Amino acid sequence: ASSLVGRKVIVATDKSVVDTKDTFKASLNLPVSSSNVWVNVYDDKGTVVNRINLGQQAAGSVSFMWDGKDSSGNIMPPGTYKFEAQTSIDGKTYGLQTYLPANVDSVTLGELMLNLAGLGSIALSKVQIIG
Amino acid sequence: SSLVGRKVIVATDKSVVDTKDTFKASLNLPVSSSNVWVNVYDDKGTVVNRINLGQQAAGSVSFMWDGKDSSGNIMPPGTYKFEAQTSIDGKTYGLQTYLPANVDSVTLGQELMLNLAGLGSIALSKVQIIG
């Protein structure tokens, strides 16, 4: 007799609660290959924190990491951060979907949903086939 | 380079099935349950089969369909619907299925989308971190 409560799942979202004591690891999907892909990192009020340039990447999934520091190398306090992945294809900028870890706080409500730390209630259609 | 022609995993309830091959996919189950199932229907909503999965733990549950109706007759290749559900304390709840689809082309919204075989234009928030 079990649930997801306490487990980490992977969610199609641009926010995640980060414990900056540990490396943060996640991915994005890139539908066309590109010479220039990146993730801007913001704090929970929209202020830029850092920029992760991923350089050239092939179509498919791309993994990335954030060490929890701002672009000045100072450790950021644990909390909710925003990850905006994008790419430049033929001189135009496109958004990419990120897949980010979240803890399940509880299960709630025909319709079941996950209550995800920092996200509120999320539908299962956003959650990755659970590991 | 393209993505075109690859197979991705989509939070959807429909998939183009080639019934000459076994069909394999997953659902997410948020709370463990003694009774989990997948109803299968043709593209007109006519019921084809019932895949009973019995008791399952919270997490990912994999399932397969051999392409046959409940009388053992091979169904024709085509779009099929997979409705995963469970029973929990006497109440029935839908579950999210994650099904394979072929990438026909890559296109714009909307603002990058996948045109998936049998599904149309689908947002990357519905697509599994691509293998």
UniProtKB/TrEMBL annotation, chain A:
Residues of the FlgD Tudor-like domain: 1-128
UniProt KW keywords: Bacterial flagellum biogenesis, Cell projection, Cilium, Flagellum
Superkingdom as given in the UniProt entry: Bacteria
One of the GO BP terms on file: bacterial-type flagellum organization
Ranges where the FlgD/Vpr Ig-like domain occurs: 19-88
Family of this protein: Belongs to the FlgD family.
Function: Required for flagellar hook formation. May act as a scaffolding protein.
Protein name: Basal-body rod modification protein FlgD
Organism of origin: Pseudomonas aeruginosa (strain ATCC 15692 / DSM 22644 / CIP 104116 / JCM 14847 / LMG 12228 / 1C / PRS 101 / PAO1)
Organism phylogeny: Bacteria, Pseudomonadati, Pseudomonadota, Gammaproteobacteria, Pseudomonadales
Residues of the full protein shown: 102 to 236 of 237
UniProtKB/TrEMBL annotation, chain B:
An annotated GO BP: bacterial-type flagellum organization
Positions of the FlgD Tudor-like domain: 1-128
The entry's keywords: Bacterial flagellum biogenesis, Cell projection, Cilium, Flagellum
Highest taxon above the source species: Bacteria
Domain FlgD/Vpr Ig-like: 18-87
Chain coiled-coil ranges: none
Task of the protein: Required for flagellar hook formation. May act as a scaffolding protein.
Family: Belongs to the FlgD family.
Name of this chain's protein: Basal-body rod modification protein FlgD
Source species of the chain: Pseudomonas aeruginosa (strain ATCC 15692 / DSM 22644 / CIP 104116 / JCM 14847 / LMG 12228 / 1C / PRS 101 / PAO1)
Primary gene name: flgD
Shown stretch of the complete protein: 103 to 236 of 237
